[PDB]
Design a protein around this ligand. Structure first.
Ligand SMILES: [Mg+2]
Ligand SMILES: [Mg+2]
Ligand SMILES: [Mg+2]
Ligand SMILES: [Mg+2]
Ligand SMILES: [Mg+2]
Ligand SMILES: [Mg+2]
Ligand SMILES: [Mg+2]
Ligand SMILES: [Mg+2]
Ligand SMILES: [Mg+2]
Ligand SMILES: [Mg+2]
Ligand SMILES: [Zn+2]
Lengths: 94, 136, 134, 38, 135, 176
RNA sequence: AGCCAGGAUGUUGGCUUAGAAGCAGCCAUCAUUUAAAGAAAGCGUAAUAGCUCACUGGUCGAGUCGGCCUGCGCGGAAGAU
RNA sequence: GAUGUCGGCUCAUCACAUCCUGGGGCUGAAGUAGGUCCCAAGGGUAUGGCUGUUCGCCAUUUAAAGUGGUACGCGAGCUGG
């Protein structure tokens, strides 16, 4: 079972997202269902190592956002144009 | 040697080569040779690299060339002054932006594709990286 | 100390055995007749391998070994020469009863413990020469 | 001695060594494998 | 490369043959060609003796399950085991002639009755005849 | 580091004198003195010598391993001693010792006279053999290299001055 | 990592060749005794031999190996008063 | 409201990408003689036949007959093909 630790984003936009990536973090989104979409920030190294396993894209993952647990599935991924880095991830509520 | 069979126009404005590539994933094969740098690949460079990777795999597996030299390059010969018309088309280039997957391969083990792509990369004017197919 | 493969009732010509063992210091007329006197029981048209043991005083003692595995598979299938490209070109056929016949003869030189162990060692010599098991 | 920009190990007996700020290839088996970066 | 699955399996195969056999011989075999060894393997299988070279760490593990837990102090240097599963003896006599005729190695220690036999007192399991001798 | 951490056992009869970085090791086979690099902290105590890095020195452990290695072969030097054997290969190639001078006949117009340094002694058991003996591992190695240098082994016949333990690979001349 | 020891049998695999016996080439690349040993990674022979590696048992006794993201350096680097 | 052009003669001066001589590594370096690269600028580095020639071809030398920069060095220094 994949357990991802996330924090809600205090900011949004181009400036804020590039600042996250410069701090070894990256933005991500959780959407689907009746709930409002949740904009989150992830640790780059932790999620990068996880997604190296094929099970990350098939299994139901759990995002831990301030104590609360969110059951999700990896929906889409924006990878860096040429480096082995992640730019953004879409999670759909499972 | 790659070249458009026919074109609407013979000559093209110099233009610029800003931005990041479209077609950054391994879409057909198992492995890919990706551009890390920005530049122009000539038809001769593309053919030299295609030959190097093909010899390496002993013409086994399958090879895809994701790039096409569709941009005509003109040149003015020696002892010719400025003006008096745009020069003559001499060769064709593909514009390359960081991230383009240039070549793809499958039907061969990873170690052989890495070696074939290492040999092909030594013919190219731009820095490259070895990439693998991903799940989404 | 040298290893050679000479015929059952033939030992004397210059091209196969002549200056091959004679260069070391072995008597050409003494060995040639002492070898054929012991290999007289061995059937006509079967190359028999012999190992030579020589000392400092030019003297010699030999131990006769059983015919080779690639040699017995030719007479059992009915062929003079093997395949140029083995497993790519089939030149003959040998039954399971013929595999145990070569193995029972080779038992004196083989390393195997059981009959099934010696039979598989002849199966490998057959595949590497183009002869298929049928 | 081969003097070139690209100095590499050419066999298992080749050894890369830095002597006085110069990368060299010293070989115990083949004299033709002796290199100096330059 | 030997994995732990491989190591556990080798302990298992030598622990099973430890239980069934009657007389076990522990010896050195360093500096002996394969020609002389394949000759002692033919002389071993014939006499109903099981022949093996096992890592001394793997032996201390197969022997812990009793009664050879005295052969521990012989698992220092190259170790070769001779497990006689058919008729007690056979090996202790086969090894003594192989040692004297080849001059190499020394033969460490022997085991029988769940008791340790020193390098000098191996004349006890060397003078014992057949089963098959009482008649 | 693995070399530095391995203590040097000073045997009975060997005297050790430490004056900061200066170490004097006296024995039956002579006396040797070395000044260790400032990065090396040497400790005596018991029948052993221990070596460690000195605080504030970036290469302490690499230096302590060198110092260890040196002091170990100093101890061996003043007890057992060192022996370098050389052998002359080639027609007319001969050697002889006259006190502290090695007379070498090596195919030159003039015979070669090599003056031995303090602490190194030579003896010729054969006209084609040189045996060097001394306490200093570095100095005996230097003398053996100097003698070999007069005629280094050639690749076509193996001719020259070679070390006894030397492997001289020969080759065939260009064909035709 | 180093050091001690082994690196076997069928078999000189088959074809080819004056010869090709792991080691010119071409094709196959199993099986046995096994702790392990490629029908052989390189040198050597006219062909053999002989030397060594892949691999494995012993010794030693706590670390060791090389990919990834990055900072700063090194070589590549020859010119005329 | 003028910075005289090619070549020669005379006189040179610097660079080194070194022609010779010096040191050295590799060699498909037995020796003699070579090939290639590294180091090295201390000195040395033809005369003639033809052509305005520089160059080039040719003859005969020499250890060698270097490659370039200097307003394609040098006409208030000469020549004037
Ligand atoms: Mg902005
Ligand atoms: Mg130096
Ligand atoms: Mg080890
Ligand atoms: Mg004026
Ligand atoms: Mg220079
Ligand atoms: Mg060159
Ligand atoms: Mg000069
Ligand atoms: Mg000349
Ligand atoms: Mg001028
Ligand atoms: Mg005038
Ligand atoms: Zn090498």
């Amino acid at each position: 079972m994949f357990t991802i630790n996330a924090e809600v984003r205090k900011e949004q936009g181009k400036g804020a997202s590039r600042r996250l990536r410069a701090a070894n973090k990256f933005p991500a989104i959780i959407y689907g269902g009746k709930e409002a979409p949740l904009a989150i920030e992830l640790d780059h190294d932790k999620v990068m190592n996880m997604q190296a396993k094929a099970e990350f894209y098939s299994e139901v993952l759990t995002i831990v956002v301030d104590g609360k647990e969110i059951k999700v599935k990896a929906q889409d991924v924006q990878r860096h144009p040429y480096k082995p880095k992640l730019q953004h991830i879409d999670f759909v509520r499972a | 040697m790659l070249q458009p069979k026919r074109t609407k126009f013979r000559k093209m404005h110099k233009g610029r080569n800003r931005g990041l590539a479209q077609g950054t994933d391994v879409s057909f094969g198992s492995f890919g040779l990706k551009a890390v740098g920005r530049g122009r690949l000539t038809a001769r460079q593309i053919e030299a690299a295609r030959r190097a990777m093909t010899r390496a795999v002993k013409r086994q597996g399958k090879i895809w060339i994701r790039v096409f030299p569709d941009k005509p390059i003109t040149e003015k010969p020696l002892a010719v002054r400025m003006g008096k018309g745009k020069g003559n088309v001499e060769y064709w280039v593909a514009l390359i932006q960081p991230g383009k997957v240039l070549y793809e391969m499958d039907g061969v083990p990873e170690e052989l594709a890495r070696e074939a792509f290492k040999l092909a990369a030594a013919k190219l004017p731009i820095k490259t990286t070895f990439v693998t197919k991903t799940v989404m | 100390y040298v290893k050679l493969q000479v015929a059952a009732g033939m030992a004397n010509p210059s091209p196969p055995v002549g200056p091959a063992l004679g260069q070391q210091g072995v008597n050409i007329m003494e060995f040639c007749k002492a070898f054929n006197a012991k290999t007289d029981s061995i059937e006509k048209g079967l190359p028999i391998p012999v190992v030579i043991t020589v000392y400092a005083d030019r003297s010699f003692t030999f131990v006769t070994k059983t015919p080779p595995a690639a040699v017995l598979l030719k007479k059992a299938a009915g062929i003079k020469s093997g395949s140029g490209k083995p497993n790519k070109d089939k030149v003959g056929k040998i039954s399971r009863a013929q595999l145990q016949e070569i193995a029972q003869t080779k038992a004196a030189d083989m390393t195997g413990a059981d009959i099934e162990a010696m039979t598989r060692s002849i199966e490998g010599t057959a595949r590497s020469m183009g002869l298929v098991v049928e | 001695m081969k003097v070139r920009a690209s100095v590499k190990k050419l066999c298992r007996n080749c050894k890369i060594v830095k002597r006085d700020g110069v990368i060299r290839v010293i070989c115990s088996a083949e004299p033709k494998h002796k290199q100096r970066q330059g | 490369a030997l994995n732990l699955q491989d190591k556990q399996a080798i302990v298992a195969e030598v622990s099973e043959v430890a239980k069934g056999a009657l007389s076990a011989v522990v010896a050195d075999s360093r500096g002996v060609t394969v020609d002389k060894m394949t000759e002692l393997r033919k002389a071993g299988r014939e006499a109903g003796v099981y022949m093996r070279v096992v890592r001394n760490t793997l032996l201390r593990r197969a022997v812990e399950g009793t009664p050879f837990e005295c052969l521990k102090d012989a698992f220092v240097g190259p170790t070769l085991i001779a497990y006689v599963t058919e008729h007690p003896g056979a090996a202790a006599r086969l090894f003594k002639e192989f040692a004297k005729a080849n001059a190499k190695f020394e033969v460490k220690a022997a085991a029988f009755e769940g008791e340790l036999i020193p390098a000098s007192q191996i004349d006890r399991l060397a003078t014992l005849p057949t089963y098959e001798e009482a008649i | 580091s693995r070399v530095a951490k391995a203590p040097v056992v000073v045997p009975a009869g060997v005297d050790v004198k430490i004056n900061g970085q200066v170490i004097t090791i006296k024995g039956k086979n002579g006396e040797l003195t070395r000044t260790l690099n400032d990065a090396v902290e040497v400790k005596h105590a018991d029948n052993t010598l221990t070596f460690g890095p000195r605080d504030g020195y970036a290469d302490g452990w690499a230096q302590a391993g060198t110092a260890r290695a040196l002091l170990n072969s100093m101890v061996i030097g003043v007890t057992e001693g060192f022996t370098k054997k050389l052998q002359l290969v080639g027609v007319g190639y001969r050697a002889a010792v006259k006190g502290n001078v090695i007379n070498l006949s090596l195919g030159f117009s003039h015979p070669v006279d090599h003056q031995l340094p303090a602490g190194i002694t030579a003896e010729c058991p054969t006209q084609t053999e040189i045996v060097l003996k001394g306490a200093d591992k570095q100095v005996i190695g230097q003398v053996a290299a100097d003698l070999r240098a007069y005629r280094r082994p050639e690749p076509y016949k193996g001719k020259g001055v070679r070390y006894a333990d030397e492997v001289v690979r020969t080759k065939e001349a260009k064909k035709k």
